[PDB]
Structures are given as structure tokens and as C-alpha cells.
């Protein structure tokens, strides 16, 4: 599924992402936008370390989900990476919350650092009623 902007904002808000561990909804929106364009079936293979990024937040298989083919990987979210490719983003959100409970918080994703940190992210939620 490829989310429309405000549709995603409300979806994430209902799933409890607004202010989760101090992270605003606009920050999550900026993350999804830059990670996959709001595409839940997006995947990115990393030939360098044999891992794959899955779903709307492009969560990596080395540490977060199990895909069975990533060498010496772990599964901190306790999900099959397949769960991160569903149209329903509930499991992906559950895993994104798990990611940010670690020390780095939202900084876990480098794309957030590159395109969202210290930027005007208000534009992502304006007019969405969130």
C-alpha cells in the first residue's frame, strides 16, 4: 500500500505514535516519507552486509526482524520481516516503537538525521487534522 499524506498521519496517530518517546507525529511522517515514500511493500537489499530494509520505515533485518537469510542477525522486534510488508502498519509501528526505545531514539535511522533533524517538518502534518 502507498499511503497518501494525511491518511498516514491519522493512521500513525491512531496507532499511538504522536509523541511516542518524545517523538512528534511530523517526525514520524518525515521518516516514512524519506524512507519509502509511504510504501509498505518497499524493500532495499544491502549487498555489503547481506541485510534487507523492510516496509514503510525500512526496518533492517540484521537487528529488528527475522528473514532467515541475514548472517548472524537478531530479531529484536520478534517479527518475521514479512510482517513489515503488510498493508496494515500496526506491526511495523510496534517495531518502530521498539527501535526508538533504544538509546538513539529517532536517530536510529540515518535518513532521519539527513532529511529530518533540525528541519521544518511541520509541512508533513499540516491540514491532516492531527
Confirm whether 53 is a catalytic residue: yes
Element (H, E) at 91: helix 90-100
Catalytic, 87? Answer no
DSSP state of 23: B
Catalytic entry in 4, 7, 18, 53: 53
The answer to whether residues 2 and 38 touch, using CB atoms and an 8 Å cutoff, is yes
Q: Which residues pair with 20 in a beta bridge?
A: 23
Q: What is the DSSP letter of 43?
A: E
Cα three-residue angle 40-126-38, rounded to 5 degrees: 10
Write down the catalytic residue from 4, 7, 18, 35: 35
Q: Which residues are catalytic?
A: 35, 53
Amino acid at each position: 500500500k502507498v499511503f497518501e499524506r494525511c491518511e498516514l498521519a491519522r493512521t500513525l496517530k491512531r496507532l499511538g505514535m504522536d509523541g511516542y518517546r518524545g517523538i512528534s507525529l511530523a517526525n514520524w511522517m518525515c521518516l516514512a516519507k524519506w524512507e519509502s515514500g509511504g510504501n509498505t511493500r518497499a524493500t532495499n537489499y544491502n549487498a555489503g552486509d547481506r541485510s534487507t530494509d523492510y516496509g514503510i520505515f525500512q526496518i533492517n533485518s540484521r537487528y529488528w526482524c527475522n528473514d532467515g537469510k541475514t548472517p548472524g542477525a537478531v530479531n529484536a522486534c520478534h517479527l518475521s520481516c514479512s510482517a513489515l510488508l503488510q498493508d496494515n502498519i500496526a506491526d511495523a509501528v510496534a517495531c518502530a516503537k521498539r527501535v526508538v526505545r533504544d538509546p538513539q531514539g529517532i536517530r536510529a535511522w540515518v535518513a532521519w538525521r539527513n532529511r529530518c533533524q533540525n528541519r521544518d517538518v511541520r509541512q508533513y502534518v499540516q491540514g491532516c487534522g492531527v
